[PDB]
Write a protein that binds this ligand. Structure first.
Ligand SMILES: CCCCCCC
Ligand SMILES: CCCCCCC
Lengths: 119, 117
């Protein structure tokens, strides 16, 4: 929705600012795992560590930051897959969240978002 | 090929080791821009900053780390687009290289590689 994209953009900009500058990072914030995770964290996607809930909320987010229905479904399919894989094991909840984001970024979901197709 | 892939895997592992541990990074090295850039740098892809040369070498790399012909072509199309866009402007050559990698990662190319899978 046009209300939530305004909000997410403001959150990306703020994450860009507060996140530590570290070596070898792309200038494009939407190419950065730490920015996406930071942004999604603020939208509450990871406020509850239950994998089923993270999955619900991620799929909801796909609808939203993407308009094309085909790409919306691809995002949902990928969110499900990434949550299933990356919430297994003994890593911390915060690191699992970061890994989920990395999995989605690697899969190409970021490219299909309105944030990327309106820079 | 299998020989090139053996070499790249060894380069990824070594980049994983030598690269600074920075906050909020995925455990998956193939999800990391700094690892990919580090790996591709070692294969000489950015050994000459001429955009035309970076493009030729990137497209060549697509054929080595991807087997599906359809995905090979997509990688090539994306490499071309990223080099064209991210080598413009006054940023340093090294940073332009990193930005190229970030552009390809964002586009999904990493997912289609044999290393990933
Ligand atoms: C999969 C739900 C949003 C992911 C953000 C793309 C990096
Ligand atoms: C410059 C080489 C393109 C392949 C990078 C994959 C992320």
């Amino acid at each position: 929705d046009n209300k939530e994209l305004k909000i997410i953009r403001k959150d990306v900009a703020e994450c860009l600012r507060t996140l530590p500058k570290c070596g070898n990072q792309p200038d494009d914030p939407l190419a950065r795992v730490d920015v996406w995770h930071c942004a999604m964290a603020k939208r509450g996607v990871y406020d509850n560590p239950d994998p089923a809930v993270i999955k619900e909320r991620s799929m909801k987010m796909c609808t939203k930051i993407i308009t094309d229905p085909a790409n919306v479904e691809n995002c949902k399919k990928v969110a499900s897959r990434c949550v299933d894989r990356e919430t297994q094991g003994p890593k911390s909840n915060r690191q699992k969240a970061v890994n989920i984001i990395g999995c989605a970024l690697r899969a190409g979901v970021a490219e299909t978002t309105v944030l990327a197709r309106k820079k």
